[PDB]
UniProtKB/Swiss-Prot annotation:
One of its GO terms (cellular component) is cytosol. Its EC number is 6.3.2.13. It comes from the Bacteria. This is UDP-N-acetylmuramoyl-L-alanyl-D-glutamate--2,6-diaminopimelate ligase. It catalyses: UDP-N-acetyl-alpha-D-muramoyl-L-alanyl-D-glutamate + meso-2,6-diaminopimelate + ATP = UDP-N-acetyl-alpha-D-muramoyl-L-alanyl-gamma-D-glutamyl-meso-2,6-diaminopimelate + ADP + phosphate + H(+). Catalyzes the addition of meso-diaminopimelic acid to the nucleotide precursor UDP-N-acetylmuramoyl-L-alanyl-D-glutamate (UMAG) in the biosynthesis of bacterial cell-wall peptidoglycan. Is also able to use many meso-diaminopimelate analogs as substrates, although much less efficiently, but not L-lysine. Keywords: ATP-binding, Cell cycle, Cell division, Cell shape, Cell wall biogenesis/degradation, Cytoplasm, Ligase, Magnesium, Nucleotide-binding, Peptidoglycan synthesis. It comes from Escherichia coli (strain K12). ATP binds at residues 113-119. PANTHER family: MUR LIGASE FAMILY MEMBER (PTHR23135), UDP-N-ACETYLMURAMOYL-L-ALANYL-D-GLUTAMATE--2,6-DIAMINOPIMELATE LIGASE MURE HOMOLOG, CHLOROPLASTIC (PTHR23135:SF4). A motif (Meso-diaminopimelate recognition motif) lies at residues 397-400. Activated by potassium phosphate. Belongs to the MurCDEF family. MurE subfamily. The keyword Membrane does not apply.
């Protein structure tokens, strides 16, 4: 790593200097480092140039605005200070070059949208790995090779991607936030593919189209069941349209993939689909319509990238849910049980609507609300459980120091017929109540904890898992 080589595309004059690491933070800037002084969120990094110099950085790249011309080379205390205009916009490119262009050295798929980002990225990583890639994720649960996810400027993104390259990753699925995009945090990444899940409108779209036009998006895979998705597809004839609700318009002669029939059953969904790559049937072990959509998006993406349909089909049954996200537990001749982390009215409603599709009998909802937290959601979650489940079982969920029954009372207050709800304190006992009472064709949703393996009672983290409790009741292994 040399300053001269680093800057060669933009500043031919730049002096030769060996460089250690690249950092935006003068505090951690050590001997031999490249310190990058940027102007942004209520801070001017150029203020910290003396400090960085005192810590013995090898070189400095600084925002030129109001201080210098683009590519102007200065020297302070024998340390080169090189100025660049629009440094925030170019930081991704600068870091990309510094870290030897990690997105040019693995297959990077970006997923954007409100919902389904985590699941879609996870599916892309899992499926590609089943097909022989060494896959990784970068997203909300964290970063890492599949099974080793560790819980962010344009520099950090490039650095992390390089770390994954260094660990042998050949494929990375990355959740990309709207905020991330606008702040140029992925500006120089070479995306192999870009997936979209789901007056003023004109400016918003204009800003988004503009930003899109400046990125290397690769193959575009778009959910045509989303209204915004359809508008983007109208202007992108090379994009792949994905639908489970009749929104493929085949007059395009473009590329598409559509679920033709879905059977939502007690252990997943049987998805029949047609596509421009051919037709098939997938046995998904994921629950709900949204997860059909997410799965279809991942399938379309991998098809577009040239993974063979037959091999994708052969591996689809091995795709697993994100731990504690509509995670199904079944045992021969027992109720279906779904563990989901839903802990807000909106998420509970969604989880119940999803569960309902797979439920031939009665839908049970076992849930509670956290103590010593905002109380407002309690009656709303009560109303949702009452409306969208057949049996509401109200129990505890991290009561902390608050009187557990008081929390349950706030929940019941939100119901039209609180008397119809089953109340059982002791979360484990409430789960058991539902699981043991529910019939064979019933579905029990256990909401609020998902993957979490503790119950906070007082100030103690007691070892408790919904997943373990449910598994043991069904005679299976979590």
């Amino acid at each position: 790593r040399n300053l001269r080589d680093l800057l060669a595309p933009w500043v031919p004059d730049a002096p030769s200097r060996a460089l250690r690491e690249m950092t935006l933070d003068s505090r951690v800037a050590a001997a031999g480092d490249l310190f990058v002084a940027v102007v942004g969120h209520q801070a001017d990094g150029r203020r910290y140039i003396p400090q960085a110099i005192a810590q013995g950085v090898a070189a400095i790249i600084a925002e030129a605005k109001d201080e210098a011309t683009d590519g102007e080379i200065r020297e302070m205390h024998g340390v080169p200070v090189i100025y660049l205009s629009q440094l925030n916009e170019r930081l991704s490119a600068l870091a990309g070059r510094f870290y030897h262009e990690p997105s040019d050295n693995l297959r990077l798929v970006g997923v954007t949208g409100t919902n389904g980002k985590t699941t879609t990225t996870q599916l892309l990583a899992q499926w590609s790995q089943l097909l022989g890639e060494i896959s990784a994720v970068m997203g909300t649960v964290g970063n890492g090779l599949l099974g080793k996810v560790i819980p962010g400027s344009a520099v950090d993104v490039q650095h992390e991607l390089a770390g994954l390259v260094d660990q042998g990753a050949t494929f990375c699925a990355m959740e990309v936030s709207s905020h991330g995009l606008v702040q140029h945090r992925v500006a120089a990444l070479k995306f192999a593919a870009s997936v979209f899940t789901n007056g003023d409108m004109e400016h918003y779209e204009a800003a988004k189209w503009l930003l899109y036009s400046e990125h290397h998006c690769g193959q575009a895979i778009i959910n045509a069941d989303d209204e915004v998705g359809r508008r983007w597809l109208a202007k992108l004839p090379d994009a792949v349209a994905v639908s489970m609700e009749d929104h493929i318009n085949p007059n395009c002669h473009g590329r598409w993939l559509k679920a033709t029939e879905v059977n939502y059953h007690d252990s997943g969904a049987t998805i029949r689909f047609s596509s421009s790559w051919g037709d098939g049937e997938i046995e998904s072990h994921l629950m709900g319509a949204f997860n059909v959509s997410n799965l279809l998006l991942a399938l379309a993406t991998l098809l577009a990238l040239g993974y063979p349909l037959a091999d994708l089909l052969k591996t689809a049954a091995r795709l697993q849910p994100v731990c504690g996200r509509m995670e199904v537990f079944t045992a021969p001749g027992k109720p279906t049980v779904v563990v989901d982390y839903a802990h807000t009215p909106d998420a509970l409603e969604k989880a119940l609507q999803a569960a309902r599709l797979h439920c031939a009998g009665k839908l049970w909802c076992v849930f509670g609300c956290g103590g010593d937290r905002d109380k407002g959601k309690r009656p709303l979650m009560g109303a949702i459980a009452e409306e969208f489940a057949d049996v509401a079982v109200v129990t505890d969920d991290n009561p902390r120091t608050e009187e557990p029954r008081a929390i349950i009372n706030d929940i019941l207050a939100g119901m039209l017929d609180a008397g119809h709800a089953k109340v059982m304190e002791g979360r484990a006992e409430a789960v058991t109540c539902a699981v043991m009472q529910a019939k064979e064709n019933d579905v029990v949703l256990v909401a609020g904890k998902g993957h979490e393996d503790y119950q906070i009672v007082g100030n103690q983290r007691l070892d408790y898992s919904d997943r373990v409790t449910v598994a043991r009741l069904l005679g299976v292994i979590a």
